[PDB]
Amino acid sequence: MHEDYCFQCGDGGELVMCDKKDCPKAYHLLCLNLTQPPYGKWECPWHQCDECSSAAVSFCEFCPHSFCKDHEKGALVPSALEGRLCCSEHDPMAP
């Protein structure tokens, strides 16, 4: 129930897995600027707004970008893949 590729860079390898309920995301230590897996239960960066410390309420489905209500305006648009939201790093026609 965790993905087989790093949500930040998209490649496989050694991945640390998110502990937040229902989150399947996993990441390279290097992509998290870490040397070892965090100690104990860990919450991945997807749940925090890109622009502040608030919890995210809207999410890019293609990378860890996500946004609180204060910062969500204009940040995400539907993509060709079932309408799943994507941030400005992706081509919505081929996310």
């Binding site: 965790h2 087989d4 590729y5 998209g10 490649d11 496989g12 390898g13 050694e14 991945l15 640390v16 897995m17 998110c18 502990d19 996993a26 897996p37 965090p38 100690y39 104990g40 239960k41 860990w42």
Partner: peptide, 10 residues
Amino acid sequence: ARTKQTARKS
């Protein structure tokens, strides 16, 4: 946190 080992691409 737990880690796992998966295959690299390309």
